[PDB]
Design a protein around this ligand. Structure first.
Ligand SMILES: Cc1cc(N2CC[C@@](C#N)(C3CC3)C2=O)cc(NC(=O)Cc2ccccc2)n1
Ligand SMILES: Cc1cc(N2CC[C@@](C#N)(C3CC3)C2=O)cc(NC(=O)Cc2ccccc2)n1
Ligand SMILES: O=C(C[C@H]1NCCC[C@@H]1O)Cn1cnc2cc(Br)c(Cl)cc2c1=O
Ligand SMILES: O=C(C[C@H]1NCCC[C@@H]1O)Cn1cnc2cc(Br)c(Cl)cc2c1=O
Lengths: 480, 484
């Protein structure tokens, strides 16, 4: 049972939702959490979608070591260092991977020798470790987390940039098509991009209850800098030695946290049908032996028919729990549809179906069950996305001048503002907004992204902070 | 680009050449760790899909537990890797990288299990583990870091747990025999060889004829209640008394790829069974550089589309800057089970030439006949690969009566099946005796013979049969040999 209200104390609500639904368990090492099966099911679904999609692009999976030698990593950072095997010291300490550039690119330098070898497109599913001192949040910001990382090498910059954009569109689909979470595609600012690359692109999500943006996934154009550092070169069709043009990209189980925060309500989780391991739960109403074998035989009959429409169905015929307990259990876990079958329903040839997202109840004849449920699930998925998109739209304010910023931040909104893109000004804006928030008593505003979808920039439009010529419309807000 | 070491002359150099020249592995500067390149990883993906699909029907659910365990939870030093520092700062308590996840999972089991309604609890996880041994590593077979799955279940009764132990072991038999076409023997480990944390260890064992060695392929343990005692994993039963759960654990690793490589490979390189080959059919246009007109590649595309609508895994090697013969050798070293050749004559006849990797036999096939024919050939290659390997397994096991038969059989690079009293002291004695006799032989890996398993499939034990070593009453036929 969830008792905290989402719109009152959001942090207590989130903790309740993910504990009481059995998504997470705590662990004695700070910043690490156990991912229980109810959460892991969702990860498996988005992993299958993304993996299928990158394979059609020619990306192949691989597995590189979890350890990197001190002198290879440092070609200290907040990495976990292994210094001993048993009681014996290693002659050189080794780190646990925070990301695998230093592990993979020496191999790329060995494998790439001619244009015949390109493009090289690899991905791996693994976990990484970033041992930060700060407060962790389950799914969103943890010390160890699951994440794929893709790394590619190309003969030209244009082919690399094309892949960057293709991958970022896959991340838009991971969020919007699977998880029903709306995201904004954009470029990172110069101060916010990956330092080892040329251009970083991102999908950004918005959490209306605390007003914060959160980076959902990222796709980098690395250019040739790592090719220089690692000596990744190839002979072109005319004999000349050239540097490769690289990309890298990743997305994590943070996606699940964003889903939970987007669609959850006062009763617990709400799982979008496309990633629900159980789409429909059938609950036999058993009491005083009122037509028991009748009811359970019928439930089995219904499961088989729905499955023949590829609906993912679970009968909760466990005998150790009451029907009321089952209603609340599957509601807190977010199953899209609950189908109730009792003696009355069997006498009438119908089932009672309740939608998780809106609570609406439907009396459906057995014959109609499969097509109707399909309609409902399409309806649920679509409505989850559309409601979320409306909230995203209501949470962004277009502004012209800096004087509008603090009122907007106080409404827990993001701002879209014309910006000159000077890196000094982003540093100044972060400092000023933090100071102002402090005085009104994590308050800094930073750039979230420069969106791909740019409204026109009228000639003569001035930067909202510096008064210099504005270049592009930029999304700002408080953030994770 | 070609394998030159012969499998039956210098097996270790053959194995290294096969897995490097096929682009399955890459070396790494940290000893005992290797990079798993896509040609190998695809196979792992296929066996992972099979096993995952099968355990899900048993109600096992996947999960993910942390890779780290606190010093005081692991030591509830071992050969584990210890993290002692974040950046330059010491941890107040060092933490180990998981060598297996019992000490990470079972405290959560103790929290989750309170009543009989909570059972059975059935979890699995796919992850990597680390065992920092100082012995020489072998790619795929024995490494410091390896991918695996490990499953862990808890039950209200011993009979239910034992049923699951046996169901999982049958899945491991199918992983090897049905996916990888490797024959394995199901058996029970001896008291000295079982997992000390458990009551009974079952195994599937494989055999490598070229070096005469047995190798453990996968394992499934009946843990009993010992871990339930240690972690206080108890439940209130249907009548209200606290009871210990009965547990199982089981695991299988990428060692299964190394066993497959050693079982089917030949002097030309790898041979990949069709059921796990990421490319089942490579189409090689007989086309030379700057000669592409569109005729050959156009038909190659039409053929690939047709074959794919039969769910055949097809690749066209249309790479412009390699000759067709180079391509033939490339994909032979990689073990692609079927090569489809398409050149000018094939176009002029409406046929294609298909060559199977395992035997080299060639077939002329009409375009229209390709899809069913290739399906048939692949079923034939899989079956044949398995049936030849099973024959070698059978030729490699000698049934014996007395200890004096043992050294001759080991010198033929064979395993022995022998009646055994099952006394643990005698297995220690046999290991030492065979090691010393091997040493003396070698003057004029170790030579010790150990138990591999006590097979499930037991021939009758005639009344009065004596143990081949102690002369005491024999209990069960036991499989022994030199081992990994
Ligand atoms: C679960 C998760 C996710 C992510 N990040 C990063 C950006 C990214 C995106 N987009 C990655 C590129 C894919 C993402 O998801 C990052 C993290 N931990 C951390 O920062 C370390 C940490 C540990 C304890 C407290 C505070 C911080 N934890
Ligand atoms: C690749 C792989 C596999 C396996 N093992 C174990 C038994 C088992 C079986 N069956 C596991 C239960 C599943 C298996 O496969 C074990 C290993 N490394 C090691 O012993 C550590 C090591 C490191 C360097 C040199 C020598 C030894 N490396
Ligand atoms: O991890 C990255 C860059 C990219 N790597 C490939 C997957 C997508 C990802 O955005 C940035 N990054 C982030 N955090 C890090 C923390 C440490 Br500790 C180190 Cl050494 C290095 C890094 C580091 O390189
Ligand atoms: O890892 C095991 C027992 C079982 N765990 C679950 C998967 C199947 C597997 O056989 C035995 N084992 C093997 N090697 C180990 C190495 C170290 Br180091 C430690 Cl601490 C512990 C162990 C250890 O417990």
């Amino acid at each position: 049972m969830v008792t905290a209200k989402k719109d009152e104390n959001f942090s207590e609500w989130y903790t309740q939702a993910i504990v009481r639904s059995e998504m997470i368990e705590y662990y004695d090492i700070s910043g690490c959490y156990i991912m229980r099966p109810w959460a892991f099911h969702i990860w498996e679904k988005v992993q299958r979608f993304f993996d299928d999609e990158i394979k059609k692009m020619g990306v192949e999976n691989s597995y590189f070591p979890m350890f990197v030698s001190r002198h290879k990593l440092e070609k200290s950072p907040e990495v976990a260092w292994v210094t001993h095997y048993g009681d014996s010291p290693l002659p050189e300490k080794i780190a646990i991977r925070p990301t695998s550039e230093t592990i993979m690119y020496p191999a790329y330098a060995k494998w790439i020798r001619s244009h015949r070898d390109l493009p090289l497109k690899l991905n791996q599913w693994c976990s990484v470790v970033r041992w930060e001192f700060k407060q962790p949040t389950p799914f969103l910001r943890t010390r160890e987390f699951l994440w794929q990382e893709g790394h590619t090498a190309h003969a030209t910059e244009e082919e690399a940039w094309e892949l960057v954009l293709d991958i970022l569109e896959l991340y838009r689909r991971w969020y919007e098509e699977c998880l029903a979470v709306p995201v904004i595609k954009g470029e990172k600012s110069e101060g916010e991009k990956f330092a080892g690359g040329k251009k970083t692109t991102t999908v950004e999500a918005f959490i209306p209850e605390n007003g914060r943006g959160i980076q959902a996934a990222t796709s980098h154009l690395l250019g040739t800098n790592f090719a220089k550092m690692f000596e990744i070169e190839f002979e072109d069709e005319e004999g000349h030695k050239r540097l490769v043009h690289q990309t890298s990209w990743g997305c994590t189980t943070r996606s699940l946290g964003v889903m939970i925060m987007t669609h959850g309500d006062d009763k617990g989780l709400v799982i979008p049908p496309r990633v629900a391991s159980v789409q429909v739960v059938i609950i036999p109403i058993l009491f005083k032996d009122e037509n028991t074998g009748e009811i359970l035989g019928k439930c089995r009959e219904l499961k088989t028919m729905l499955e023949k429409a590829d609906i993912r169905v679970r009968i909760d015929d466990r005998s150790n729990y009451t029907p009321g307990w089952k209603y609340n259990h599957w509601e807190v876990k977010g199953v899209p549809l609950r189908l109730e079958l009792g003696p009355k329903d069997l006498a009438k040839g119908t089932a009672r179906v309740v939608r998780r997202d809106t609570g609406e109840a439907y009396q459906i004849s057995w014959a109609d069950l499969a097509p109707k449920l399909l309609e409902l699930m399409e309806g649920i998925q679509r409505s989850l996305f559309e409601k979320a998109k409306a909230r995203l739209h209501e949470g962004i304010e277009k502004i012209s001048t800096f004087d509008e910023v603090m009122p907007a931040l106080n409404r827990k909104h993001l701002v879209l503002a014309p910006w000159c893109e000077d890196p000094e000004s982003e540093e100044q804006i972060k400092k000023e907004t933090q100071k102002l928030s402090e005085i009104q008593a994590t308050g800094a505003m930073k750039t979230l992204c420069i969106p791909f979808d740019q409204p026109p920039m009228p000639e003569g439009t001035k930067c909202f902070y510096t008064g210099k010529p504005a270049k592009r419309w930029t999304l700002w807000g408080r953030s994770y």
